[PDB]
Design an enzyme around this catalytic site. Structure first.
Site, PDB file in Angstrom:
ATOM      1  N   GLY A  77       0.672  -1.269  -0.003  1.00 36.16           N
ATOM      2  CA  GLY A  77      -0.044   0.056   0.075  1.00 36.16           C
ATOM      3  C   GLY A  77       0.829   1.405   0.127  1.00 36.16           C
ATOM      4  N   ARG A  78       0.365   2.228  -0.253  1.00 36.52           N
ATOM      5  CA  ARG A  78       1.100   3.716  -0.317  1.00 36.52           C
ATOM      6  C   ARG A  78       0.300   4.958  -0.283  1.00 36.52           C
ATOM      7  NH1 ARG A  78       6.225   3.267  -4.067  1.00 36.52           N
ATOM      8  NH2 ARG A  78       7.408   2.901  -2.192  1.00 36.52           N
ATOM      9  N   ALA A  80      -0.711   9.124   1.340  1.00 34.88           N
ATOM     10  CA  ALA A  80      -0.107  10.241   1.102  1.00 34.88           C
ATOM     11  C   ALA A  80       1.001  10.431   2.172  1.00 34.88           C
ATOM     12  CB  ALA A  80      -0.979  11.391   1.071  1.00 34.88           C
ATOM     13  N   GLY A  82       2.468   7.573   4.114  1.00 33.81           N
ATOM     14  CA  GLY A  82       3.414   6.689   4.016  1.00 33.81           C
ATOM     15  C   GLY A  82       3.024   5.254   3.435  1.00 33.81           C
ATOM     16  N   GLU A  83       3.856   4.086   3.345  1.00 35.97           N
ATOM     17  CA  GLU A  83       3.628   2.958   2.966  1.00 35.97           C
ATOM     18  C   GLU A  83       3.228   1.903   3.976  1.00 35.97           C
ATOM     19  OE1 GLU A  83       7.111   2.499   0.619  1.00 35.97           O
ATOM     20  OE2 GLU A  83       8.407   1.845   2.214  1.00 35.97           O
ATOM     21  N   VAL A  84       2.403   0.882   3.571  1.00 38.07           N
ATOM     22  CA  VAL A  84       2.017  -0.234   4.366  1.00 38.07           C
ATOM     23  C   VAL A  84       2.787  -1.249   3.748  1.00 38.07           C
ATOM     24  CG1 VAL A  84       0.170  -2.149   4.517  1.00 38.07           C
ATOM     25  CG2 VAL A  84      -0.287   0.254   5.088  1.00 38.07           C
ATOM     26  N   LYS A  99       2.424  -0.538   9.025  1.00 39.73           N
ATOM     27  CA  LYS A  99       2.522   0.850   8.405  1.00 39.73           C
ATOM     28  C   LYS A  99       3.418   2.016   8.707  1.00 39.73           C
ATOM     29  CE  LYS A  99      -1.576   3.393   9.140  1.00 39.73           C
ATOM     30  NZ  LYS A  99      -2.629   4.273   8.896  1.00 39.73           N
ATOM     31  N   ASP A 192     -14.472   7.701   7.421  1.00 39.51           N
ATOM     32  CA  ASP A 192     -13.932   7.230   6.101  1.00 39.51           C
ATOM     33  C   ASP A 192     -14.270   6.024   5.619  1.00 39.51           C
ATOM     34  OD1 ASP A 192     -12.712   7.787   3.756  1.00 39.51           O
ATOM     35  OD2 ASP A 192     -10.579   7.561   4.482  1.00 39.51           O
TER      36      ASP A 192
HETATM   37  C1  LIG Z   1      -2.847  -5.903   4.819  1.00 37.66           C
HETATM   38  C2  LIG Z   1      -2.886  -4.423   4.335  1.00 37.66           C
HETATM   39  C3  LIG Z   1      -3.116  -3.611   4.896  1.00 37.66           C
HETATM   40  N1  LIG Z   1      -3.076  -2.122   4.406  1.00 37.66           N
HETATM   41  C4  LIG Z   1      -3.658  -1.955   3.371  1.00 37.66           C
HETATM   42  C5  LIG Z   1      -2.724  -1.703   2.232  1.00 37.66           C
HETATM   43  C6  LIG Z   1      -3.284  -1.780   0.739  1.00 37.66           C
HETATM   44  C7  LIG Z   1      -4.514  -1.309   0.593  1.00 37.66           C
HETATM   45  O1  LIG Z   1      -4.918  -1.395  -0.721  1.00 37.66           O
HETATM   46  C8  LIG Z   1      -4.374  -0.877  -1.780  1.00 37.66           C
HETATM   47  C9  LIG Z   1      -4.559   0.577  -1.911  1.00 37.66           C
HETATM   48  C10 LIG Z   1      -6.233   0.988  -1.977  1.00 37.66           C
HETATM   49  C11 LIG Z   1      -6.827   0.311  -3.026  1.00 37.66           C
HETATM   50  N2  LIG Z   1      -6.604  -1.498  -3.159  1.00 37.66           N
HETATM   51  C12 LIG Z   1      -5.140  -1.465  -3.109  1.00 37.66           C
HETATM   52  C13 LIG Z   1      -5.501  -1.706   1.579  1.00 37.66           C
HETATM   53  C14 LIG Z   1      -5.091  -1.830   2.880  1.00 37.66           C
HETATM   54  C15 LIG Z   1      -3.173  -3.793   6.539  1.00 37.66           C
HETATM   55  C16 LIG Z   1      -3.657  -2.986   7.555  1.00 37.66           C
HETATM   56  C17 LIG Z   1      -3.473  -3.638   8.560  1.00 37.66           C
HETATM   57  N3  LIG Z   1      -3.539  -5.227   8.125  1.00 37.66           N
HETATM   58  C18 LIG Z   1      -3.253  -4.980   6.884  1.00 37.66           C
HETATM   59  N4  LIG Z   1      -2.960  -6.204   6.215  1.00 37.66           N
END
Ligand SMILES: c1cc(Nc2ccc(O[C@@H]3CCCNC3)cc2)c2cc[nH]c2n1
Ligand SMILES: c1cc(Nc2ccc(O[C@@H]3CCCNC3)cc2)c2cc[nH]c2n1
EC number: 2.7.11.1
Lengths: 391, 391
Positions: A77-78, A80, A82-84, A99, A192
């Site tokens: 994920g990413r 505004a 920071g990244e996950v 995160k 949200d």
């Molecule tokens: C996994 C993912 C997580 N975050 C997360 C990362 C990316 C995401 O989606 C991308 C961007 C939006 C559209 N679709 C693709 C959604 C959530 C978390 C948080 C806690 N545990 C997690 N395990």
């Protein structure tokens, strides 16, 4: 008298208390980070304070949990801020999702409190509907939230891969109604609610994972906000109006977003889509005229009524008299689950995952400047004191 | 790895470590005291930090040991930095002697470290020759040292009430030689050895109580100081010379002061008395010519030789080859005590004390402005972080 030391010690042992050991240790690290500059050390008080705490603070940072204890497996994920990252603990060989929130951009855009409610919800909710926070730590440049990895991806990914029938839509909507009720139970308004913040666990069940826009309700279940928050497609009219000042709304703004989500799931488009953001805002405000169902949308009268029941002005919107009038809407009439056991039943879609680091339900990501040196004391690390938490 | 949390926790449990709970709690209280001003709260970082810690810091101050837990019985001393008070703990009904050091004058005269060695010597020496510190605490205006009350007064008071024979002088000098050896054993140089800092316990035995001028020796048992410290009558020539720069001296400056003390005890006058301070400094420097014994001074040849052995230039002064050449000086030849048991023997003068609050050996005292409001962060309470100690 006498038991005052035991009463004081009880506050330092409580993880809810803001004066626990990790919070007091943050108070020292933040002070050392915000005073250690050539300019500020011209002060006789500052220079002598630093001389006796520099060595020990640097030993404490290295002793405590650090970013280096994890192997970044993949950036999934990413936002505004920071990244996950999908990470693996070097010692335990355990896979968590971490995160990173830029201390630079979080302070720079004035946003230095949105993470508090997220931290407390994840660390202390203990709900099966909220992603758990195991460790919160930080370094000079970032905040770190080590959370349970949700391997099934978000509802955006599901909707993109499947023509969601109403049998599945009943399910995902019910799980969202219960997750929001758990948040509202904790005295919070999400603000949200969108399929992007609805993650699927290893069995295909929902958990809410982003809590940045959360806001604690007052004793009347109401909030005073003069700033529009959320995603354009899902912002309720009351939250849009709040931008003009005198914002006073309750938890019903989350039920509006549920209806937008249910429309998107069954119709395949957002109910108020337009090319401009202002075009979307106009349609949201003019919902009485702008809300319509396509003539090719395969949707039941009960599903249309529930969506319309949610997409109205807060005054008469479903959910104003509690969650029970939502739970007994005929749309949820099904022969597969009950509200008291829905999470124990089979999910419509169970994720296919070959390994503990399988991140197939997350799109690949293609890979935050430094704070300026202060002339006078700024205390940029002060809003972050007490972020550290170890489960 | 893994045991890093147990290793970190071990540092917070150690009272010697500067990151124990009370020191971390000080780091928070000092930050709240030094930021809580209308002027500084113009900073968005400062104001939001204070809003979440104001309530809890004020609860912590009230929960912790405070000046209000003691009943001031009598003011018995009064230095330039603050008074020594005979106090009684309201809950325990126990009588201690409490020293108050003005945070205003200690910071104002630049003196913000002299108390550290005093705190550590008293809190951790565990010697029968050093007055014990039970609790060190502080408030916005003062530092507080709750120490054992020495009811017999100082050697100045004794000398004023008695014609001290050499049988008593042998005793008090030996107790001083052992007390200094205990300080030197701990790697410190006293630098202010005078009868004013030699107190008598409930049985008439000596304990050193003031340690303001203490200084830690380097690995060569030497000190680098460019500032004259101590009392004019007892300053050694090397400490006087140090004022002109390039000061390099060892623990032998304390043996000089012992000789001045022994002269004062047997002769009834200081060896280098003059009306001006500069007259005294001239006599000290010119000791080879200025040191003389009155023709009516009832003193033995051994007592005169020991005084002369101490009152010479550091290069050849007794004590340069260790404390054993002091201990075997014929002046100490007596049939009442041994160096290994002197503290178990009968003191020459045992104080007469009717009650636990009897302060008859202390002259009556006939009864420190506020810090200015800072425009920018000054951190005036920073030199005091870690002063708090509870036995
Ligand atoms: C996994 C993912 C997580 N975050 C997360 C990362 C990316 C995401 O989606 C991308 C961007 C939006 C559209 N679709 C693709 C959604 C959530 C978390 C948080 C806690 N545990 C997690 N395990
Ligand atoms: C008792 C007293 C103490 N201080 C102290 C107070 C006054 C003193 O003397 C006055 C001034 C100098 C000339 N003579 C009269 C000496 C020492 C302490 C310190 C720890 N315990 C104590 N118990």
């Amino acid at each position: 008298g006498a038991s005052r030391q035991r009463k004081l010690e009880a506050l330092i042992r409580d993880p809810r208390s803001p004066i626990n050991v990790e919070s007091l240790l943050d108070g020292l690290n933040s002070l050392v980070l915000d005073l250690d500059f050539p300019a500020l050390r011209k002060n006789k008080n500052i220079d002598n304070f630093l001389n006796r705490y520099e060595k020990i603070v640097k030993k404490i940072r290295g002793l405590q949990m650090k970013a280096e204890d994890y192997d970044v497996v993949k950036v999934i994920g990413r936002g505004a801020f920071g990244e996950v990252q999908l990470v693996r603990h070097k010692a335990s060989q355990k896979v968590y999702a971490m995160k990173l929130l830029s201390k630079f951009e979080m302070i720079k855009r004035s946003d230095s409190a949105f993470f508090w409610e997220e931290r407390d919800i994840m660390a202390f909710a203990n709900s099966p509907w909220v992603v758990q926070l195991f460790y919160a730590f930080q370094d000079d440049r970032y905040l770190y939230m080590v959370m349970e990895y949700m391997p099934g991806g978000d509802l955006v990914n599901l909707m993109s891969n499947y023509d969601v029938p109403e049998k599945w839509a009943k399910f995902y909507t019910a799980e969202v109604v219960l997750a929001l009720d758990a948040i509202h139970s904790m005295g919070l308004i999400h603000r949200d609610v969108k399929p992007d913040n609805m993650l699927l666990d290893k069995h295909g069940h929902l958990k809410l994972a982003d809590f940045g826009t959360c806001m604690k309700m007052d004793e009347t279940g109401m909030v005073h906000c003069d700033t529009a928050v959320g995603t354009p497609d899902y912002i309720s009219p009351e939250v849009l109006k709040s931008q003009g000042g005198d914002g006073f709304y309750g938890r019903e703004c989350d039920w509006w977003s549920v209806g937008v989500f249910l429309y998107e799931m069954l119709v395949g488009d957002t109910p108020f889509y337009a090319d401009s953001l202002v075009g979307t805002y106009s349609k949201i405000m003019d919902h009485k005229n702008s809300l319509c169902f396509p003539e090719d949308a395969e949707i039941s009268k009960h599903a249309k009524n529930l969506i319309c029941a949610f997409l109205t002005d807060r005054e008469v919107r479903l959910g104003r008299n509690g969650v029970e009038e939502i739970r007994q809407h005929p749309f949820f009439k099904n022969d597969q689950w009950h509200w008291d056991n829905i999470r124990e039943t089979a999910a419509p879609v169970v994720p296919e995952l070959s390994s503990d680091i399988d991140s197939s339900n997350f799109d690949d990501i293609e890979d935050v400047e430094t704070f300026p040196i202060p002339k006078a004391f700024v205390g940029n690390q002060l809003p972050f004191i007490g972020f550290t938490y170890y489960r």
